[PDB]
């Protein structure tokens, strides 16, 4: 299986201890 983040994607940084979303992002252009 290959997972290739070569197109727009979401990244969500979370903490399980508190069930918190620290940061949410959509990357449409990483350049």
């Amino acid at each position: 299986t290959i997972v290739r983040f070569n197109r727009p994607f979401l990244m969500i940084i979370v903490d399980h201890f508190t069930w918190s979303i620290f940061f949410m992002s959509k990357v449409t252009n990483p350049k």
Binding site: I2, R7, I12, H16, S20, F23, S25, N29
Partner: protein, 338 residues
Amino acid sequence: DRGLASANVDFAFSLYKQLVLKAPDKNVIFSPLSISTALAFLSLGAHNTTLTEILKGLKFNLTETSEAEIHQSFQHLLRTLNQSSDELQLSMGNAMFVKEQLSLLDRFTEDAKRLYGSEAFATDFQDSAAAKKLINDYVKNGTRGKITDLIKDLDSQTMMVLVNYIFFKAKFEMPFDPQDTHQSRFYLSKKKYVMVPMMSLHHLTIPYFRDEELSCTVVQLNYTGNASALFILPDQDKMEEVEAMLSQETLARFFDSLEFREIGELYLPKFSISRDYNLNDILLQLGIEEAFTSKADLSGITGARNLAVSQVVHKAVLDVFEEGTEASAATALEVLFQ
């Protein structure tokens, strides 16, 4: 507290949808937790409709949790989110910057310190450059240099600014080897592509979920046993479709549906992005309206209905590299006299 947790996740998705609406094709980075915390701090001084509008806008249900329990929940959360290990640094702070002669109620300043960790810094807003430096330096210190000009313009008649910052720096449990980073295509769309530094890992076992109904693939890269990055990769031309399905329910389903899977190759760009926002229009859309008008009741701050919100600003940065991730954000609520 599962109640705080659910409200904060719901608020995150509501904010995300409206931030995308500003510019649906642009990069997005924000800290929903920073904005929730800053507005909860403001609510400590709010009464009556101003108060209920803030708490309901933050997605709290006042029939299941009182104002006091909400603040107690933020106090607990904040104490947990200041921690340091070799793998993870996290800091969050709150502050108020106040015209020196403005009389503040002792209850408010006591509660702000006890519950939100907020000191009060005397600020001469009529010396706008000095006031902006004081605030921006506080955010620069708290974010270890990563957010430096949160406040650009600041009304010389400002009475108070409430500020939250968050700082996060972590190592991946499975770091990428820089030797395996190479320039590779990134498709901005089916027909537009550029070359970016593309990190890669080989033969790794991580939590994985293919959502065929939503045409997306989900993987989780851990930093520690509690902190992780959930990545959602829509199939080509399905980003808007996936965005349309986002919610607390959908995110929980993604997490519950993850299973460890052997991955032949994972490719992820090395990138650093930054955005800044004025949140007035969004907060009004979310029902937080009286705080911005002459009907505002912030009399828990001063003992009179003599303050209202003028501007809400947010700035956030996200840096992803082979060893880990750094992300920071700050929120300022600027307050005028009335």
